[PDB]
Ligand binder design. Structure first.
Ligand SMILES: *C/C=C(C)/C=C/C=C(C)/C=C/C1=C(C)CCCC1(C)C
Ligand SMILES: [Mg+2]
Ligand SMILES: [Mg+2]
Length: 220
């Protein structure tokens, strides 16, 4: 009963991507061009992964490879967008990308490690530790940096950061409650539906807010 929700996610990502692409044309400043390329590439990768999952690919018997591939690809792009908005140094960005990659890779270790019970909980704990480190990172240095560019930049970055963090904090709960790498409290179809809603949020809503605020970010 999950094909319906996979196709819903597919169509939603497709609409988001087409909308972002139509918004992209006519861009002048190269920074806006970077914003448009990244913000359109994220939902396109998501749509490709969702179409793969919906058409008999994407899942291997016991494992879901398309979701984790999409995550490994797209989460660094969102981090890059946030850092560009805040103007963080390249070293901080490398740190953030490595920490996020470690988080997703730990999540994938739990989806594939299904021998006992404590081993997935340990993988979830360490990946959530990496998540908490990223949370600490986004609230501290990046916010002070964005405020150091200007106050409008600070407010815009705070809105983007609130959206990002609030939406990202729910993925590990879905993971720990689901059937894959979890305890089976919720079924597979509810897991996929909640992932679809979270992806709609984190990819289309964030991109809309970012691309709406480009005029005020330049004038500061
Ligand atoms: C566009 C895709 C997004 C925003 C999804 C990101 C995924 C996560 C933040 C998930 C993180 C996890 C943990 C914090 C620990 C348990 C395993 C994961 C991968 C579900
Ligand atoms: Mg996603
Ligand atoms: Mg998300």
């Amino acid at each position: 009963s999950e094909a319906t929700w996979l196709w819903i996610g597919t169509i939603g990502m497709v609409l988001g991507t087409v909308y972002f692409a139509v918004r992209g044309r006519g861009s002048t400043d190269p920074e806006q061009q970077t914003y448009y390329i990244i913000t359109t590439l994220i939902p396109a990768i998501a749509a490709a992964a969702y179409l793969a999952m919906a058409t008999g690919l994407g899942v291997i018997s016991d494992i879901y490879w398309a979701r984790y591939a999409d995550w490994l690809l797209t989460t660094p792009l969102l981090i890059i967008d946030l850092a560009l908005v805040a103007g963080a140094r390249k070293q901080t960005l490398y740190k953030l990308i490595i920490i996020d990659a470690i988080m997703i890779l730990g999540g994938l270790a739990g989806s594939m490690m299904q021998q006992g019970a404590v081993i997935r909980i340990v993988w979830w704990a360490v990946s959530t530790a990496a998540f908490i480190i990223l949370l600490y990172y986004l609230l501290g240095e990046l916010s002070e940096r964005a405020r150091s560019r200007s106050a409008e930049t600070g407010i815009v970055f705070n809105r983007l950061r609130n959206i990002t963090l609030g939406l990202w904090a729910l993925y590990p709960i879905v993971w720990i409650l689901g059937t894959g790498g979890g305890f089976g409290i919720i079924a597979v179809t509810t897991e996929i539906m909640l992932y679809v809603m979270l992806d709609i949020g984190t990819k289309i809503g964030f991109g809309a807010v970012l691309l709406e605020s480009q005029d005020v970010l330049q004038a500061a």
